[PDB]
């Protein structure tokens, strides 16, 4: 029966879009769904069809990374390998110290008290939070609401948390320390609530990553099928013409651009390299990257934006940085992926999971050259094992319960864990 459901996300369009199909599935079952983020995300929430709740104030954070011109990858923010074998106690502690200090706090502290305040007014039965939107579980706990993470990610966050807690138990009492406990327990303490480990990983985890590609973890885990949502979308007229040869799709973005930096292969050189091959190229590039081009190859169409969910059917290859929208839309379409990227968020893991399943190829961005690009693209087109592997991953996605199918499960888990 009838629920108030508060979705919470950091002010990233790309994260928001991963949450939209689940939000709509719950709304279509008659529940009230509101989505809360900083004011900067208000317009993006509004164009998803869902009701926006602006909370708190904006952070400086995406005004920072775009006047950066410089890579985000950093040994301390590389969580691509969350194993005990690569993390002494002091290395894991440090990784939490920097990530809490220089990411989670900037993302959440601007809006956490205003979110708690909104939850107090609205009394959601359930909070569903993006995996780094730790303001979400804090707000839920303060009102006794159930809460769950909704994953766009290979779950490096929970796995590194497993590595952390294992090394925490090995230390003597007088040098136990937990940056997540201090920070979030601090905020919860202000409201007369205690910290608990379900505030870091949720009461359960709704997971859009195919099981065969996800890290094994001690979680209550609800698999859900990834349904492409690529933001505001129209079908262009030129999409009717089947290509006559393999279509190769390339996506840069203002977020991809801001993370990879300007030291790696220029996107002009990538277009020139693809422009020499017997392929149909569609490249989606931000406007500043569009004028860095001298000449547009005869085989190439440049666009601002084109919805991948409509373009990728019968595409042969997608080249991207390992963002989820791109990764997922290719996956459900059975398209081999080439992912030249960095150890930021789970992007490396997005690449390496496909590389190891034989469905795509990953390469570090600093090793990308005209010849590596040319040969990777040719292999993914020519060698049928890539398409065949990708097709099997597609089939795994299509066997996963839809958002529609997991609504009852979310309803019961809420009765169980709610107040």
Ligand X SMILES: Cc1cn([C@H]2C[C@H](O)[C@@H](COP(=O)(O)OP(=O)(O)O)O2)c(=O)[nH]c1=O
Q: Which residues bind a second copy (CB under 8 A)?
A: 2, 20-22, 24-25, 27-30, 32, 34, 42, 45-54, 121, 225, 227, 229, 232-235, 240, 307, 309-310, 398, 402-405, 407
Tokens 């990227």 correspond to 341
Token pair recorded at residue 301: 């169409």
136, 147 Cβ separation under 8 angstroms: yes
Interface contacts to ligand X, rule CB under 6 A? 13-14, 17, 230-231, 251, 253-256, 284, 305-308, 320, 323, 325-326
Beta strands in 122-207 (DSSP E): 126-129, 146-151, 204-207
Is 305 labelled as part of a ligand binding site?
yes
- Quote the least distance from Cβ 311 to ligand X, whole Å: 7
Select 202 or 253, whichever has its Cβ closest to ligand X. Answer: 253
- Residue 305 binding target from Cl ion, ligand X, a second copy, none, CB below 5 to 8 Å by type: ligand X
Instruction: Give whichever of 168 and 407 is closer to a second copy, judged by the CB atom.
Output: 407
| 3 state DSSP class of 32 | strand
Q: Say if residue 254 carries a ligand binding annotation.
A: yes
Contact at 8 Å (CB) between 128 and 147? Answer: yes
What DSSP designation does 259 have?
A: H
Contacted by 284, from ligand X, Cl ion, a second copy, none: CB < 5 to 8 Å by type = ligand X
Q: Which does 325 bind (CB under 5 to 8 A by kind): a second copy, Cl ion, ligand X, none?
A: ligand X
Residue 59 or 229: which CB sits closer to a second copy?
229
Helix H, strand E, coil C: the string for 284-333 is ECCHHHHHCCCCCCCCEEEECCCCHHHHCCCCCEEECCCCHHHHHHHHHH
Residue whose C-alpha is closest to residue 267's, from 246, 248, 253: 253
Residue 319, both tokens: 């080249």
Would you count residue 298 as binding Cl ion (CB under 5 A)?
A: yes
* Shortest spacing between CB 259 and ligand X, in angstroms: 8
Kindly tell me which of 34 and 59 has the beta carbon lying closer to a second copy: 34
Q: Can you tell me which residue has the tokens 């290859």?
A: 317
Q: Which stretch binds Cl ion (CB under 5 A): 226-234, 258-266, 290-298, 371-379?
A: 290-298
Torsions phi, psi of 365, nearest 5? -70, -25
Residue 24's binding partner among a second copy, Cl ion, ligand X, none (Cβ under 5 to 8 angstroms by kind) is a second copy
- Point out which span in 63-71, 148-156, 213-221, 298-306 binds Cl ion (CB under 5 A): 298-306
Length of the chain: 419
Nearest Cα to Cα of residue 157 among 80, 211, 88: 80
Q: For ligand X, which is the closer residue by CB, 161 or 321?
A: 321
Q: Give 248's strand partners.
A: 281, 317
Q: Binding site for UDP: residue ranges? A: 13, 230, 254-255, 305-306, 308
Q: Binding site for dTDP: residue ranges? A: 230, 255-256, 305-306, 308, 326
Q: Binding site: residue ranges? A: 13, 230, 254-256, 305-306, 308, 326
């Amino acid at each position: 029966s009838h629920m108030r459901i508060l979705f919470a996300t950091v002010s990233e369009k790309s994260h928001l879009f991963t949450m939209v199909p689940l939000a709509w599935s719950l709304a279509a079952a008659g529940h009230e769904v509101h989505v809360a983020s900083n004011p900067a995300l208000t317009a993006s929430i509004k164009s998803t069809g869902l009701t926006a709740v602006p909370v708190g104030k904006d952070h400086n954070l995406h005004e920072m990374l775009t006047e950066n011109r410089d890579s985000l990858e950093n040994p301390l923010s590389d969580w691509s390998t969350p194993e005990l074998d690569r993390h002494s106690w002091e290395q894991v502690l440090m990784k939490f110290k920097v990530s809490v200090m220089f990411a989670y706090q900037t993302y959440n502290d601007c809006m956490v008290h205003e979110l708690v305040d909104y939850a107090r007014h609205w009394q959601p039965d359930l909070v569903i939070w993006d995996p780094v939107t730790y303001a979400g579980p804090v707000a839920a706990r303060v009102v006794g609401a159930a809460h769950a993470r909704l994953l766009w990610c290979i779950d490096i966050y929970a796995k590194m948390r497993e590595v952390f807690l294992a090394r925490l138990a090995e230390q003597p009492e007088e040098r136990r320390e937990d940056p997540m406990a201090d920070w979030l327990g601090g905020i919860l303490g202000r409201y007369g609530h205690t910290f608990d480990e379900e505030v870091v990983v949720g009461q359960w985890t709704i997971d859009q990553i195919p099981t065969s590609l996800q890290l094994p973890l001690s979680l209550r885990r609800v698999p859900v099928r990834y349904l492409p949502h690529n933001g505001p979308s129209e079908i262009p007229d030129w999409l009717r013409e089947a290509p006559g040869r393999p279509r190769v799709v390339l996506t840069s973005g203002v977020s991809a651009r801001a993370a990879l930096g300007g030291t790696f292969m220029p996107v002009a050189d990538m277009i020139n390299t693809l422009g020499s091959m017997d392929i149909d190229v569609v490249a989606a590039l931000p406007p500043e990257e569009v004028e860095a081009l001298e000449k547009v190859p005869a085989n190439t169409r440049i666009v601002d934006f084109v919805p991948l969910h409509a373009l990728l059917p019968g595409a042969s290859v997608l080249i991207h940085h390992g963002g989820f929208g791109s990764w997922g839309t290719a996956l459900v379409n059975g398209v081999p992926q080439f992912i030249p990227t960095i150890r930021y968020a789970d992007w490396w893991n997005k690449g390496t999971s496909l590389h190891e399943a034989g469905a795509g190829l990953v390469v570090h961005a600093s090793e990308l050259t005209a010849e590596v690009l040319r040969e990777s693209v040719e292999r993914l087109v020519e060698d049928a094992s890539y398409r065949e592997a990708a097709e099997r991953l597609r089939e795994e996605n299509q066997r996963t319960p839809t958002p529609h199918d997991v609504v009852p499960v979310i309803e019961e888990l809420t009765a169980e864990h709610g107040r």
